[PDB]
Amino acid sequence: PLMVKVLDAVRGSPAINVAVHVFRKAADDTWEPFASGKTSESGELHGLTTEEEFVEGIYKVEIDTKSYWKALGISPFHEHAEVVFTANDSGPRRYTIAALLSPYSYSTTAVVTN
Amino acid sequence: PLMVKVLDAVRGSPAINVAVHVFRKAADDTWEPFASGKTSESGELHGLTTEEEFVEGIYKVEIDTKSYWKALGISPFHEHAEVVFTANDSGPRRYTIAALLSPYSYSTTAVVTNP
Amino acid sequence: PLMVKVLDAVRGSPAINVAVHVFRKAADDTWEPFASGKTSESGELHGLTTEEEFVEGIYKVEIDTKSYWKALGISPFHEHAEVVFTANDSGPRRYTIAALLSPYSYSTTAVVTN
C-alpha cells in the first residue's frame, strides 16, 4: 500500500541507503512511529506496511536527506525532507511517495493508483 | 532576513493568501512558534522576523498548502509543505524559501545570501 | 538502454498515453527521428532502442505535454517538454529520463545506472 522512491538530482542516480521514517498522527496530535527502513540500490523502500495496518489517517514520511548528502561529502541545507498527507480509502489504493533531492532543494510527488 | 515565495503550477500565478507558520526548535526539542503570515498578491511574505530575533537554530517553515487548495475548491494530497533547516550557524544570512505547488506535488528551494 | 517515465503532479498518477519522440543530432546539426512511442498505464516507455543502435551522441526526448493536458480538459503553458543530453559510453550504462508534469511547470531528472 505504501512505497517510497528517492532520486538524486546531482549524480543522476537512485538515492541509496537513505533512512526513511513513517509516523502516524495519534489522537493526542503527536507523531507515533509507524514504519521505517533504508532505500535499496534502486532508491526504493518496499514492505513498510500492510493493507490491514495502513488505515485512514494523517501520515508523515521523513527522509534523512542530511545524512545522505554528508555521506557523499556534500553540505546540505535541509535537516530532512518531510511529506505529510492524509490516506483516504476512496477505492482500492496504492501510494507511491517520490522525492527528488538536491543539496538546497527537493521535489516530492504522490502517485496514487488502483 | 527570512522571505517566503509561493507559486501555483496549475494557474501559472503567484500563490496568493497562503498561510505560513515558522517554528524554532527549543532547548526541550519541541517546536516553539516563531512567526507567521500570509503571502501577498505577488505570492511573497516579507516581514516575518528581524536580524535581532532570527538567531541560530533549527527552523521549520510550514506552508499551509491544503488550506490554499481547499480555498480554491480543490482536494489536495499533502497537509502542508514543511521546510526544516539550520539557520545563521555561521553568522547572519538572508534566506528565501521558495515553493512551487501542484495538488499532488510540490518543489521547494532555498536561496541563501551573505548580506 | 533508454527508458522514459512521465508523472502527473496534478492528479498524482502516471502520465498515461503521452506521445514521446526521441531524436538524434545528425552531422548537419538537424534532429533525425530515432525512436518514439506512447507511455503505458505505468507512465513508462520501454523498448525505444537497443544497445547496438544507442551510440554516443546528442539526443532529444520530446514529450507531447500539450496534448496530454488538453485530453484532460486542462489549459497548459508549454508546447512540449524537451530533454536534450549527450549519451556517454564511460562503462555499462542505462538511462532513465523522468519527467514530472504540471500545467505551467515540469521537472526532469536522469537516473544513469550500471
Place this chain on the structure above:
Amino acid sequence: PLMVKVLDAVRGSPAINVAVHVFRKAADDTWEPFASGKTSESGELHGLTTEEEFVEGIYKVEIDTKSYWKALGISPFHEHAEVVFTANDSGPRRYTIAALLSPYSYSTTAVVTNP
C-alpha cells in the same frame, strides 16, 4: 514582458552568468533568433525584449545549463534547458521563466501576469 530567473540547487545561490537564447518560430517553421543575454549577480535576465517586439508566436527559451556547469568545473547531464510556449495569443502578457538547476536535473515554471 519577458524575464528569466535561474537558481542553483547545489550552491543555494542565484545561477550567475548563465547564457540564455530566445528563438521565435518563423512562417517557414524554423527557429529565428529573437533575443539573448546573460543572468546577472541575482540570477535574473531583464531587458530581453519590448512590448512592441514581443508579438504573438511560439517562443523557445534556451538556458545554456551545460556551459554554466562546465564553467564551474562540473560535467553535467543536459546540453541545455529548453522552454517552449505560445505567448501573447490573448493579448500582451508578462512572462517570468524560472529555472532551478542541478547537474542531472532541472525544474522550470512560468509566471504569467496580465499588465
